[PDB]
Amino acid sequence: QWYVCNREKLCESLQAVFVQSYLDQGTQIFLNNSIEKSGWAAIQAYHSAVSSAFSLAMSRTSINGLLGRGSMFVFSPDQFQRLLKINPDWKTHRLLDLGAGDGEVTKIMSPHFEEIYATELSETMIWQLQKKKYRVLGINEWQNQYDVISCLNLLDRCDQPLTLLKDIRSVLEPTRGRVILALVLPFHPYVENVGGKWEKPSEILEIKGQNWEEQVNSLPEVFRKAGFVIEAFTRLPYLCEGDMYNDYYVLDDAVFVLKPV
Amino acid sequence: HQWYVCNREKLCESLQAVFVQSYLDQGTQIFLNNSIEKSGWAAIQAYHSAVSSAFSLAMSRTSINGLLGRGSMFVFSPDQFQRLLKINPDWKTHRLLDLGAGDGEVTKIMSPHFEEIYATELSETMIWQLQKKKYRVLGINEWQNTGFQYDVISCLNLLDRCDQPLTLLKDIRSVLEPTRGRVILALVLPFHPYVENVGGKWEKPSEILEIKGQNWEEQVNSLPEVFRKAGFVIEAFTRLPYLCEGDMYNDYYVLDDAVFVLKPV
Amino acid sequence: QGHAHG
Amino acid sequence: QGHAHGH
Ligand SMILES: Nc1ncnc2c1ncn2[C@@H]1O[C@H](CSCC[C@H](N)C(=O)O)[C@@H](O)[C@H]1O
Ligand SMILES: Nc1ncnc2c1ncn2[C@@H]1O[C@H](CSCC[C@H](N)C(=O)O)[C@@H](O)[C@H]1O
């Protein structure tokens, strides 16, 4: 199963605030729609065609964001609000989704915030983030106050992760404002580039272990090196729209809710 | 030809002494002869206009041309370049920096005079083609803080396409090698700047230049007082045709380029 | 092709 | 189309 974690191997700090997640409704919508689109033969062939012709002149991310394809799923609205421990009509002023992809994972968060900001490298992904009427900021413009800051599967796709986490604490509202973070495990970071080639990150984030279990036990050491404690955390399937050979694609996530301490 | 000729009499006293006549040489002719050949490729041009049209909304036309490798451009030939910076065909120094390098074929002319080549570029597909040529692409706001100066800083046909051209000029001066360093600078005239967006939208620039006049000889005279303000004087300059590959309608396209060599003041 | 993230 | 420098 995608949701079980060996609780016995977890460190007691994390056992205390481990939220248990499951294949809820919202996850099923996504899976269903990922099976529906992976039946549209004409679409699945035009995605296959565009990407293969342009694969050596754009990054996959940019190609995925040119077609509106490869949309991904992290948490249902219900899952999201339970992790945060809030009400379905709860609301605040500012969200920030850093490296937001196509905004679909940002959409599921949007009804809880009045204003929405996001950053991104891919300029076709900036386009779709702007098609949703979000406010886009530069990679270094958002660190000049945000009520919630989102950093979902970016710490393994960016060059300066520790700077990011210290930058996040810089502009996060302190009294109540929380951050939500996701991280594919086992850890394997790289800086994607055009043509499938990639750069290695500049800063190194120390993730001990060979397993989801031991690896998350190494992150409390890290979240306070930038100024956060884990208020809650769960395990989710990092779902992605399939193609023509598979109806969807899964990866092993770990999502955290963080307070400034 | 009518591309390289200006009424020198309508140039100011400062600029009448630094003008360098250019000529339609054998290197500009190789380019037209390829442009013409590429327009002749019926299947390729239709394919270019088929792609360029589909994705007109998601991407800027700069990155679409860079997606397809089409739309390469031309400012000077090896011989013309060497005749403006006044250097041998075997001249050589350490470091070049091409700001807003585009697709790289204009940098590829300057290239063999430097053993290190740096470029900045706002477009993700251009940046790849720049990397394709083994060029070290820097951050748009990262070339100023490298830790090393630049022997020649190239800035061709960008001041009418960027957001803060004055901050740019002052930036070039701050990191340019002070003793023997020069900048080579290209401007299209009639000066008409705008900042490119996606889908055809175009914001205006956050800084205004005073490149104003009724002809080529008039706007060029506006530039000594401009260049003076950012710490440069014009060591030489010339009139060159800004040229670009064609599509199905015209074998090539021609804009009116002023090229300068500026020395730190 | 496959996952958009990896 | 036209010139790649833009319009
Ligand atoms: N330094 C950086 N700043 C902002 N975005 C970045 C970045 N480095 C990489 N990215 C973007 O981060 C994305 C990683 S995939 C994650 C996207 C989305 N948050 C999700 O969870 O599905 C890529 O789209 C990439 O374009
Ligand atoms: N602010 C900026 N910083 C870096 N590059 C920029 C920029 N604004 C525009 N550019 C790039 O500069 C180019 C201007 S068109 C000029 C292309 C090329 N330098 C030539 O002389 O032919 C475009 O490709 C655009 O992407």
Residue numbers in the entry:
A (entry chain B): 55 to 198, 202 to 318
B (entry chain A): 54 to 318
C (entry chain D): -3 to 2
D (entry chain C): -3 to 3
Task: Quote the study's own text.
Unlike SETD3 or METTL18, which methylates a unique substrate, METTL9 specifically recognizes an xHxH motif (H is for histidine and x denotes small residues.) and catalyzes the methylation of the second histidine. xHxH, as a known metal binding motif, is found in a wide range of metal binding proteins, suggesting the potential role of METTL9-dependent histidine methylation in mediating the metal binding capacities for those proteins.
To understand the selectivity of METTL9 toward residues at the −1 position, we further solved the structure of METTL9M6 with the SLC39A5 mutant S374A (S-1A) at a resolution of 2.75 Å with the mutant peptide well resolved.
